[PDB]
Symmetry: C2
């Protein structure tokens, strides 16, 4: 039910390590192009490097407020703006997870709205940090945060930063997200997706985009180049 080419067409091939250099990013783009993936995803200061080498047809995503989500709205929004100016066409922003856990959904809304309005032409993905929302609160909060993101104009909800100790994507989280907002928003599964078996599980749960760092190993699990 999943060919390598189909999967590749929904992969964001990602490098977000603090120690990443320009050479690491040009190597990421070369790998992304070789694998035929949808996008590369990089940190804000490295967008320009990615944009300078990406072929037409490889999208560029940047993260905003990442990984912690602990930035005021105006900073997230300006970071997003600057990344789009540098060549990103998609932004993956992190919510203030603590605001969500505190029940301050009006603050979560305001944050997403600030970013949305700063990058109105971009594809905006909202990282909800689902493993943390599920661990520290539960399913209702995860569903509610997804509704907040929808109502604030996000294009996607996304599971995870890959940096939080509660973990990454789970089938349970993706199913909740897809059932809550999947009729209107994309669902990006990310964090800890290392194998084709895992990727397939996420796609079957309702993911429409995958965020991978080891994309070649995942894709090889679906078939040969």
């Amino acid at each position: 039910d999943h060919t390598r080419a189909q999967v590749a067409a929904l992969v964001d091939h990602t490098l977000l390590k603090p120690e990443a250099t320009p050479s690491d990013v040009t190597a990421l783009v070369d790998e992304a192009a070789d694998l035929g993936v949808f996008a590369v995803c990089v940190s804000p200061p490295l967008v320009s490097v990615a944009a300078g080498v990406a072929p037409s047809g490889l999208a560029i995503a940047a993260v905003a407020g990442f990984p912690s989500g602990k930035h005021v709205p105006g900073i997230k929004a300006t970071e997003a703006e600057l990344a789009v100016a540098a060549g990103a066409t998609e932004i993956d922003m992190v919510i203030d997870v603590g605001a969500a856990l505190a029940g301050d959904l009006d603050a979560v809304s305001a944050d997403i709205t600030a970013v949305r309005k700063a990058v109105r032409a971009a594809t905006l993905k909202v990282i909800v940090e689902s493993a943390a929302l599920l661990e520290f609160s539960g399913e209702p909060l995860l569903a509610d945060v997804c509704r907040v993101a929808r109502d604030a104009g996000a294009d996607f909800v996304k599971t995870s930063t890959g940096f939080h100790p509660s973990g990454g994507a789970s089938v349970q989280a993706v199913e909740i997200m897809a059932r809550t907002v999947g009729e209107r928003l994309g669902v990006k599964a990310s964090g800890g997706i290392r194998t084709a078996e895992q990727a397939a599980a996420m796609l079957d749960a309702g993911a429409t985009r995958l965020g991978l760092s080891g994309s070649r190993a995942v894709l090889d699990g679906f078939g040969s180049a």
Copy 2:
């Protein structure tokens, strides 16, 4: 050679988890007050909560560009400025570690300089991510980043975010930092300091400030309140 009171007077009592709430920060401030520490350190969106309950004498540190360091200079500087407006008196910024590893020390300098100029009256600490500089390059790079921080006007160098897989403070790192800039700059040891024995090792190596999250257990190892 260290009394409890002396150690407390150089502790920054810290909470930086993504899931931190306002009430978590109010509790942090109360604990810091009870322990008689120098400062509390919190994330930018939580500075005003901390400032709103901090007793007389307690300094407030905010992180900037944290934890990844992967933010453009204009964002780090504006984040710092906003945190000072919210009540911070100190800023602990993170360098772009990848820029340092690429040999782009001019970029590192420009980043520190931008923050320095935006918060001229604050105490500025520069997190060098010493465990990563040592792992991926070595001692000369650590010393050179300290020289850059000094020349860009920083008040302190600081070992670690506590979030990087390379690790936290080490005696080796503190000794290099102290040798390089300790006659002019403070040296803050942070990341993984859980016990009095570890804290004392860092102080003996040349640290003049400690970043702790479990400050009571450290202080109780030195003696009674």
